[PDB]
Amino acid sequence: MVRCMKDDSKGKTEEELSDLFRMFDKNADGYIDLEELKIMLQATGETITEDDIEELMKDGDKNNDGRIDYDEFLEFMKGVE
Ligand SMILES: [Mg+2]
Numbered sequence: 001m002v003r004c005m006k007d008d009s010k011g012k013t014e015e016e017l018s019d020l021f022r023m024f025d026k027n028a029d030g031y032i033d034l035e036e037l038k039i040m041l042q043a044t045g046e047t048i049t050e051d052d053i054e055e056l057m058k059d060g061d062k063n064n065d066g067r068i069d070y071d072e073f074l075e076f077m078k079g080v081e
């Protein structure tokens with residue numbers, strides 16, 4: 001009423017990255033494959049090789065399952081040095 005009201009609703013948090021994760025997906029399945037991630041790359045203004053595209057998979061696939069999920073991907077955009 002005066003100070004305590006509703007729950008803490010900060011500005012842009014991690015969840016905000018959810019909007020960026022979907023962008024990487026084309027079929028909206030929650031997981032990105034080598035074929036999907038390739039589309040987002042080709043669409044770019046530059047030219048990317050197959051090797052570069054694969055480098056992204058291994059760089060975001062910690063479980064080595066074959067696809068990247070919002071969980072493991074979240075860390076991807078949380079520093080890539
Ligand atoms: Mg996909």
Ligand SMILES: [Mg+2]
Pocket residue numbers: 060061062063064065066067068069072
């Ligand atoms: Mg994975």
